[PDB]
Write a protein that binds this ligand. Sequence first.
Ligand SMILES: COc1ccc2cc3[n+](cc2c1OC)CCc1cc2c(cc1-3)OCO2
Ligand SMILES: [Ca+2]
Ligand SMILES: [Ca+2]
Length: 124
Amino acid sequence: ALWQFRSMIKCAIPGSHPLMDFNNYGCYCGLGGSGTPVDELDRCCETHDNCYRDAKNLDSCKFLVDNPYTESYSYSCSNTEITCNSKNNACEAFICNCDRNAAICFSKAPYNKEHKNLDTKKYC
Ligand SMILES: COc1ccc2cc3[n+](cc2c1OC)CCc1cc2c(cc1-3)OCO2
Ligand SMILES: [Ca+2]
Ligand SMILES: [Ca+2]
Protein backbone atom coordinates (compact mmCIF):
# COMPACT_ATOMS: atom_id res chain seq x y z
CA ALA A 1 0.00 0.00 0.00
CA LEU A 2 1.15 3.59 -0.59
CA TRP A 3 2.15 4.38 3.00
CA GLN A 4 4.31 1.23 3.10
CA PHE A 5 6.12 2.21 -0.07
CA ARG A 6 7.04 5.54 1.47
CA SER A 7 8.38 3.69 4.46
CA MET A 8 10.24 1.19 2.20
CA ILE A 9 12.08 4.18 0.75
CA LYS A 10 13.03 5.46 4.20
CA CYS A 11 14.25 1.95 4.93
CA ALA A 12 16.48 2.03 1.83
CA ILE A 13 17.53 5.69 2.10
CA PRO A 14 17.57 6.67 5.77
CA GLY A 15 18.08 10.39 5.16
CA SER A 16 15.12 10.70 2.67
CA HIS A 17 11.75 12.40 2.86
CA PRO A 18 10.03 10.24 0.18
CA LEU A 19 7.10 12.54 -0.62
CA MET A 20 9.33 15.63 -0.79
CA ASP A 21 12.16 13.80 -2.65
CA PHE A 22 10.52 11.41 -5.10
CA ASN A 23 7.04 12.80 -5.79
CA ASN A 24 6.77 14.94 -8.86
CA TYR A 25 10.30 14.05 -9.91
CA GLY A 26 11.11 13.84 -13.62
CA CYS A 27 8.58 12.46 -16.02
CA TYR A 28 7.43 9.32 -14.06
CA CYS A 29 7.79 9.96 -10.32
CA GLY A 30 4.29 11.28 -9.66
CA LEU A 31 0.77 10.52 -10.96
CA GLY A 32 0.79 8.88 -14.40
CA GLY A 33 3.69 9.61 -16.69
CA SER A 34 4.53 10.52 -20.28
CA GLY A 35 7.42 10.36 -22.79
CA THR A 36 10.81 8.98 -21.85
CA PRO A 37 12.32 9.05 -18.37
CA VAL A 38 15.05 11.75 -17.97
CA ASP A 39 17.55 9.82 -15.77
CA GLU A 40 17.92 6.47 -13.94
CA LEU A 41 15.82 7.65 -10.92
CA ASP A 42 13.03 8.79 -13.18
CA ARG A 43 13.47 5.42 -14.93
CA CYS A 44 13.00 3.58 -11.61
CA CYS A 45 9.65 5.41 -11.41
CA GLU A 46 8.46 4.32 -14.92
CA THR A 47 9.41 0.67 -14.20
CA HIS A 48 7.30 1.06 -10.95
CA ASP A 49 4.40 2.49 -12.95
CA ASN A 50 4.86 -0.37 -15.39
CA CYS A 51 5.14 -2.86 -12.48
CA TYR A 52 1.79 -1.51 -11.16
CA ARG A 53 0.17 -1.85 -14.66
CA ASP A 54 1.15 -5.54 -14.82
CA ALA A 55 -0.35 -6.30 -11.36
CA LYS A 56 -3.67 -4.83 -12.55
CA ASN A 57 -3.41 -6.97 -15.70
CA LEU A 58 -3.32 -10.11 -13.41
CA ASP A 59 -6.74 -11.72 -13.80
CA SER A 60 -6.40 -13.19 -10.28
CA CYS A 61 -6.09 -9.82 -8.53
CA LYS A 62 -8.99 -7.40 -8.13
CA PHE A 63 -7.53 -4.44 -6.21
CA LEU A 64 -9.87 -2.12 -4.30
CA VAL A 65 -10.96 0.79 -6.55
CA ASP A 66 -8.59 -0.81 -9.07
CA ASN A 67 -5.56 0.74 -7.39
CA PRO A 68 -2.67 -1.51 -6.23
CA TYR A 69 -1.72 1.25 -3.77
CA THR A 70 -4.65 0.26 -1.58
CA GLU A 71 -3.25 -3.20 -1.07
CA SER A 72 -1.29 -3.70 2.14
CA TYR A 73 1.31 -6.50 2.41
CA SER A 74 3.74 -7.42 5.12
CA TYR A 75 7.40 -6.48 4.98
CA SER A 76 10.27 -5.63 7.25
CA CYS A 77 13.30 -3.30 7.36
CA SER A 78 16.64 -4.23 8.84
CA ASN A 79 19.83 -2.26 8.36
CA THR A 80 18.89 -0.93 4.97
CA GLU A 81 17.44 -4.29 3.76
CA ILE A 82 13.79 -4.68 2.69
CA THR A 83 12.24 -8.18 3.03
CA CYS A 84 8.84 -8.88 1.49
CA ASN A 85 7.16 -11.48 3.72
CA SER A 86 6.82 -14.91 2.08
CA LYS A 87 3.31 -15.23 3.62
CA ASN A 88 2.05 -12.33 1.41
CA ASN A 89 -0.50 -13.66 -1.11
CA ALA A 90 0.46 -13.73 -4.77
CA CYS A 91 -1.09 -10.27 -5.38
CA GLU A 92 0.40 -8.69 -2.25
CA ALA A 93 3.71 -10.26 -3.11
CA PHE A 94 3.66 -8.79 -6.66
CA ILE A 95 3.00 -5.29 -5.21
CA CYS A 96 5.54 -5.79 -2.43
CA ASN A 97 8.14 -6.60 -5.09
CA CYS A 98 7.19 -3.60 -7.23
CA ASP A 99 7.70 -1.36 -4.18
CA ARG A 100 10.91 -3.05 -2.99
CA ASN A 101 12.61 -3.03 -6.41
CA ALA A 102 11.65 0.61 -6.69
CA ALA A 103 13.02 1.52 -3.22
CA ILE A 104 16.26 -0.37 -4.01
CA CYS A 105 16.44 1.38 -7.49
CA PHE A 106 15.89 4.84 -5.93
CA SER A 107 18.72 4.16 -3.52
CA LYS A 108 21.23 3.67 -6.35
CA ALA A 109 20.11 6.28 -8.93
CA PRO A 110 21.85 9.71 -8.94
CA TYR A 111 19.50 12.34 -7.50
CA ASN A 112 19.49 15.31 -9.84
CA LYS A 113 17.95 18.33 -8.10
CA GLU A 114 17.02 19.87 -11.44
CA HIS A 115 14.61 17.12 -12.39
CA LYS A 116 12.41 17.82 -9.37
CA ASN A 117 9.20 19.57 -10.39
CA LEU A 118 10.22 19.29 -14.05
CA ASP A 119 8.28 21.11 -16.70
CA THR A 120 6.62 17.84 -17.90
CA LYS A 121 4.39 19.43 -20.57
CA LYS A 122 7.71 20.61 -22.24
CA TYR A 123 10.24 17.89 -21.43
CA CYS A 124 8.27 14.69 -21.14
C1 LIG B 1 -3.95 6.52 -5.43
O1 LIG B 1 -4.15 7.94 -5.13
C2 LIG B 1 -2.89 8.37 -4.96
C3 LIG B 1 -2.47 8.83 -3.72
C4 LIG B 1 -1.17 9.25 -3.57
C5 LIG B 1 -0.28 9.19 -4.63
C6 LIG B 1 1.15 9.66 -4.36
C7 LIG B 1 2.12 8.99 -5.37
N1 LIG B 1 1.60 8.55 -6.63
C8 LIG B 1 0.23 8.71 -6.92
C9 LIG B 1 -0.71 8.73 -5.87
C10 LIG B 1 -2.03 8.30 -6.03
O2 LIG B 1 -2.56 7.83 -7.22
C11 LIG B 1 -2.80 6.54 -7.72
C12 LIG B 1 2.46 7.94 -7.57
C13 LIG B 1 3.81 7.77 -7.28
C14 LIG B 1 4.35 8.21 -6.07
C15 LIG B 1 5.72 8.05 -5.80
C16 LIG B 1 6.22 8.48 -4.58
C17 LIG B 1 5.38 9.08 -3.63
C18 LIG B 1 4.03 9.25 -3.90
C19 LIG B 1 3.50 8.81 -5.12
O3 LIG B 1 6.09 9.41 -2.53
C20 LIG B 1 7.15 8.47 -2.62
O4 LIG B 1 7.45 8.45 -4.03
CA1 LIG C 1 4.16 7.53 -12.13
CA1 LIG D 1 -3.55 -6.74 1.62
